[PDB]
Design an enzyme around this catalytic site. Structure first.
Site, PDB file in Angstrom:
ATOM      1  CE1 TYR B 155      33.408  37.041 -12.312  1.00  0.00           C
ATOM      2  CE2 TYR B 155      32.193  36.576 -14.185  1.00  0.00           C
ATOM      3  CZ  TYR B 155      33.495  37.043 -13.735  1.00  0.00           C
ATOM      4  OH  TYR B 155      34.301  37.294 -14.394  1.00  0.00           O
ATOM      5  N   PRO B 193      47.666  30.995 -16.781  1.00  0.00           N
ATOM      6  CG  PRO B 193      50.041  31.649 -15.909  1.00  0.00           C
ATOM      7  CD  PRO B 193      48.710  32.247 -16.546  1.00  0.00           C
TER       8      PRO B 193
END
Ligand SMILES: NC(=O)c1ccc[n+]([C@@H]2O[C@H](COP(=O)([O-])OP(=O)(O)OC[C@H]3O[C@@H](n4cnc5c(N)ncnc54)[C@H](O)[C@@H]3O)[C@@H](O)[C@H]2O)c1
Ligand SMILES: NC(=O)c1ccc[n+]([C@@H]2O[C@H](COP(=O)([O-])OP(=O)(O)OC[C@H]3O[C@@H](n4cnc5c(N)ncnc54)[C@H](O)[C@@H]3O)[C@@H](O)[C@H]2O)c1
Ligand SMILES: NC(=O)c1ccc[n+]([C@@H]2O[C@H](COP(=O)([O-])OP(=O)(O)OC[C@H]3O[C@@H](n4cnc5c(N)ncnc54)[C@H](O)[C@@H]3O)[C@@H](O)[C@H]2O)c1
Ligand SMILES: NC(=O)c1ccc[n+]([C@@H]2O[C@H](COP(=O)([O-])OP(=O)(O)OC[C@H]3O[C@@H](n4cnc5c(N)ncnc54)[C@H](O)[C@@H]3O)[C@@H](O)[C@H]2O)c1
Ligand SMILES: C[C@@H](O)c1ccccc1
Ligand SMILES: C[C@@H](O)c1ccccc1
Ligand SMILES: C[C@@H](O)c1ccccc1
Ligand SMILES: C[C@@H](O)c1ccccc1
Ligand SMILES: [Mg+2]
Ligand SMILES: [Mg+2]
Lengths: 251, 251, 251, 251
Positions: B155, B193
């Site tokens: 990443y 979420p």
């Protein structure tokens, strides 16, 4: 419209160029504004050109004047209620290398560009902390806070100082839950009536080896990033540097 | 209101979290929007939740899919007219150190986070250059494009790549007078979420040693900086990094 | 051995800790060294502990003392011949936030950490330019020139100033073919007798959330990067920052 | 002399220019060295020009070749004992803007400059961790890992990726007490036989608007910073960027 509803802002050096555009857009977005300058003749004219007194007023003050800073906050609150927003924009330059900077030049520039920003930031934190204002301190810290310029030695010192001192202040305010954010704005070269009076300057600033866009900016370019930072839209931004420079620092 | 009047935007991974908030605020400010996801079930529901079809539509596409990128631009222009704005937001993560990253993991993450951003930026420049659109490419490049994380090796590679590749693109567009700006946005930790479904994650992200504000952000925090960058308010900003991180990188 | 043959160095605050180690390694590599402190009792003892007078001497001087700087260069040249190398290492700290920094504290810290570094850099350029010395000015500019610390507000200001002022000086020296390089060194936390006297400090500095190596450095860690920068090995390095911090700023 | 006593180093692309100078100085300082290239004709000649086989050998290997990386470490250890030091120096460039980069060009450059550095770093950590070697991984990450260049789009992507992926690796190695450091080196323009064969390139690189020193560097400029990073002198440096660029990035 309405992006700064309820805000009460102080903008140092708010009577000309970048500061004046910040003031203009701040009023347009619903803020009340107190602008400063050391010169009352410039300042009184500036405020009226932007709006009425329920919108914008002028307060004479040299940002290097520690005691005056206190007078300035009191006058702003008298006019508009508690201050929520401070833009430390006043600054000067000297076109000397480090080698050729006199001590008097050094001290004078640091008094405005570094001491003044310290005084404003320190007082702003004290006056704004813990009031639910969504308070924001915006410190003008230049492309010359990222890169050197051989003929701006003292200016570079001041801008690098503001850049990192602001991080310190940001961190302490965040850790203490003060409801005060601190960020820096880093303009590249901007066209103003002053730059216009420096023969050849805009053209020099616009060479691709300087500003890759091939032109310099306008005052409103800096106003709009300041609106974002003053507003609650930027409630999670603190301790950061916002560069608006036409690509200057990207190469 | 009206800050993106006339704009036509593509937002990759625009169906959830940050991307969905960008889409929401873009519509609120007058842009037409095409959102993407690889999952049609998420995407069709997402668009309708924001607005009507004259406002916002969905196009199924994995950002790692080079040929699809072309399909996506054509569909967006069919719906809304020429694209002015691209937000390369789709991304994935792997929670592996460099040492423990498999080659398959490496390739998969780079395909989305690096190749996908390259494909979108390259096509966006070609499709947007020289049309008077005030075009803007916004690449999501993370706090992890500034600092390392021991468990985000691939990443980190991808985000550092996006950070500097965007500068290259910015510079070439500026030098060639293409009327395309390229900038990066660097979120800190944001509550969604998904983060909620990772037990303990928000609390971990909110420790002062991580985020000095003591809490994480919200999707709209990233939406508002994207509105600024998509708008003509930011016409002099190119090649720069815009960090919204709660102080994470300031310490 | 011999990496600094022929060099003549001034090291401010060269009597303790980091400065003393720089002095020690500089002599070991063939440099002649003048160390300073404001306290003659510390300084006379320090020099003798490193070497003989043909190697190293002490000169009493507070780096904030502008006129003394001139005395210092003259004494060094009298002893050893023309100065080639300056290490601006003297510094102080205040453990105050920006909010809680008194004006007296501000001024005192800036006098040493900022004015002193300016005075030394300015004089060093004048005294070293155009002599074929392979001259090098090394300015100590801290991890706190990169990141903020909530309780080091004035220190952060000073270190950010040094960081960027040094770039200015580097650029002007390079552009004018002065044969003077200017670079900054940025230590993380280093163990010294002083840190030892601050109860709990080393342990606090060694937490992984602070220094990822899990321990702090030693004085020689900073000495060795200074040897490189003082030597002709680094003849193409100018205007750059050299960080030796155990990973502090990498996260 | 002796600064790398006992060390065993792999230098990818160690047969020419910067890599060859690193190899040369590494041997001079007591390291054993394995250099690589994909071309055996260049590589066999290169090793003999530096030293004897007890000092330096050649191993044919393309850094993009994952399986070969394993062969390379085994051959180096067979020759010299356990590897302590890895310099990921092999790289290629494409002179294309992002807009004009073909997908084949993109993939080819990333295979060498990004995948190859990943493969080497990953394997190096596995092979070097926990052996008391004072292990050091030095990744070549360019001035083009800091600034963009309009005609180096893919190269910029790769160098920004290396810059931040290295921080990740540094942090994980430090946190896990692996006795492996990871740092990046960022050359500016360096004169080599290859640059010489590009008509006008050195002159172009030497303009003050590019390199403020007014000339470009030499291979040994990069060798000497690599000696420091490979040596135990730099035992507290990890996760950092070491720039040797003639002032390029300072303006
Ligand atoms: N104009 C540019 O091209 C440019 C480029 C880079 C950075 N900057 C920075 O942007 C900021 C604002 O620029 P500007 O356009 O308003 O400047 P300006 O050049 O138009 O005019 C100078 C401004 O500084 C203020 N000022 C100077 N000394 C002061 C003092 N002692 N007390 C109070 N105010 C004082 C004045 O109000 C005046 O508006 C400055 O800090 C400047 O350093 C400007
Ligand atoms: N949520 C955070 O805390 C956080 C923190 C740092 C950075 N970011 C970055 O911000 C960006 C947006 O975050 P988010 O909240 O939308 O993510 P999310 O965690 O809520 O959900 C993942 C998103 O990525 C998109 N996506 C993933 N793979 C894709 C593919 N192959 N093709 C198309 N779309 C794909 C999906 O549309 C989805 O909306 C991402 O690039 C992420 O890396 C997020
Ligand atoms: N020790 C650490 O952990 C640490 C961490 C980060 C940065 N630094 C920086 O590294 C540099 C050197 O550290 P150190 O170990 O030598 O400091 P030290 O803590 O061991 O001792 C203070 C040093 O500063 C010098 N000094 C202070 N005020 C002075 C004055 N007015 N005039 C002349 N000299 C003065 C003294 O000679 C003394 O050696 C300093 O600039 C410091 O800010 C140190
Ligand atoms: N020469 C410069 O002006 C300059 C400027 C900036 C950055 N750099 C970077 O510095 C590093 C070293 O430069 P250099 O002088 O050795 O390069 P060079 O230009 O002299 O020659 C290219 C080098 O790369 C290696 N190489 C290329 N592809 C390879 C592959 N697939 N497998 C193994 N090795 C490969 C070769 O061994 C060769 O030595 C490179 O990573 C380069 O990107 C160089
Ligand atoms: C950097 C900018 O503030 C400037 C300073 C001096 C002269 C012109 C422009
Ligand atoms: C950095 C952010 O994108 C993240 C990545 C993996 C797991 C949680 C959060
Ligand atoms: C940053 C370092 O110089 C320090 C400052 C004050 C107290 C302890 C350590
Ligand atoms: C940046 C340097 O590696 C370079 C790349 C392509 C052509 C010349 C030089
Ligand atoms: Mg950090
Ligand atoms: Mg530059």
């Amino acid at each position: 419209s309405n992006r700064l509803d309820g805000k009460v802002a102080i903008i140092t050096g708010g009577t000309l160029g970048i500061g004046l555009a910040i003031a203009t857009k701040f009023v347009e977005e619903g803020a009340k504004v107190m602008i400063t300058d050391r010169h009352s003749d410039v300042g009184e004219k500036a405020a009226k050109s932007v709006g009425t007194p329920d919108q914008i007023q002028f307060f004479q003050h040299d940002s290097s004047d520690e005691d005056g800073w206190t007078k300035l906050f009191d006058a702003t609150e008298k006019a508009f209620g508690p201050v929520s927003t401070l833009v430390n924009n006043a600054g000067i330059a000297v076109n000397k290398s480090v080698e050729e900077t006199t001590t008097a030049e050094w001290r004078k520039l640091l008094a405005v560009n570094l001491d003044g920003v310290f005084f404003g930031t320190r007082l702003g934190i004290q006056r704004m902390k813990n009031k639910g204002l969504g308070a924001s301190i915006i410190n003008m810290s230049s492309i010359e806070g990222f890169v050197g310029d051989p003929s701006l030695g003292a200016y570079n010192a001041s801008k690098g100082a503001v850049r990192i001192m602001s991080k310190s202040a940001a961190l302490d305010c965040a850790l203490k839950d003060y409801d005060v954010r601190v960020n820096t704005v880093h303009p590249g070269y901007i066209k103003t009536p002053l730059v216009d009076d420096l023969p050849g300057a805009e053209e020099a600033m616009s060479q691709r080896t300087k500003t890759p866009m091939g032109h310099i900016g306008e005052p409103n370019d800096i106003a709009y990033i300041c609106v974002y930072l003053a507003s609650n839209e930027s409630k999670f931004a603190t301790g950061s540097e916002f560069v608006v420079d036409g690509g200057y620092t990207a190469q």
